[PDB]
Amino acid sequence: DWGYDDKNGPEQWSKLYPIANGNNQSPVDIKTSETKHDTSLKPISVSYNPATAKEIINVGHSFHVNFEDNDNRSVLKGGPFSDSYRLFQFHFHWGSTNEHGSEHTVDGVKYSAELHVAHWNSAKYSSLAEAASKADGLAVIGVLMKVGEANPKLQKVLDALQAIKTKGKRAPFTNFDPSTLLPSSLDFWTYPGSLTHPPLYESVTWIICKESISVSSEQLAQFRSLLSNVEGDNAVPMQHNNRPTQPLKGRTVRASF
Ligand SMILES: [Zn+2]
């Protein structure tokens, strides 16, 4: 079983998942002096239907907000993509303290947390399960979260956590459009990469926003007070779930700006 502690964590993952030492691993440090501006990149277009919001789940290492993905009610288009990608989930990563917590870094700078909005290629594939292992199967928008002012758009999500405190708990989570969590500028970086935890498939086209969103110290505390243990066991707070940055191995990070 994999996690984030020292026995089962990022430095150990290569034992059952050798792709952890692959050539297209994520996250990465984005060095802005080494990025290549690409005039061919189109604007990012998101069109999400709040009716697709389904469920919030404590998954032990994190929590997930899942969406109905049976049709194209909620889609990502544009950027580097010719295909339409269907929303299926969003989640966050965070760290032990405010000083770290993001997965991607920019010129070496670590942010406090990171939002991931994940989609699958419904133009080419019939299901998430099919798409997840294909090079062009997944598209994830990453948004760096900078500690500062409380973010009111996080409210519904944070209010839901009291109902899913321990591992395996789940609740309906409905009528929510996660494009409300995105920054006002959708200027972005893009590079070919991977899932940031097992199974670590190199199936993700990353879209990293240039503009951060805010999160308060107390909002981050709410993430960290989720519990990784099952109900009735000794409490084990979910202190962190960010992977260290990985070698670019010659990949190019492109800029839309
Ligand atoms: Zn993630």
Swiss-Prot record:
GO annotations of cellular component type: cytoplasm; cytosol; extracellular exosome
This protein's name: Carbonic anhydrase 1
Organism: Homo sapiens (Human)
Pfam families: Carb_anhydrase
Keyword line: Acetylation, Cytoplasm, Lyase, Metal-binding, Zinc
Catalysed conversion reaction: hydrogencarbonate + H(+) = CO2 + H2O; urea = cyanamide + H2O
Single GO term (MF): arylesterase activity
Annotated Zn(2+) 2 binding sites: H61, H64, H197
Entries under PANTHER family matching the protein: CARBONIC ANHYDRASE (PTHR18952), CARBONIC ANHYDRASE 1 (PTHR18952:SF282)
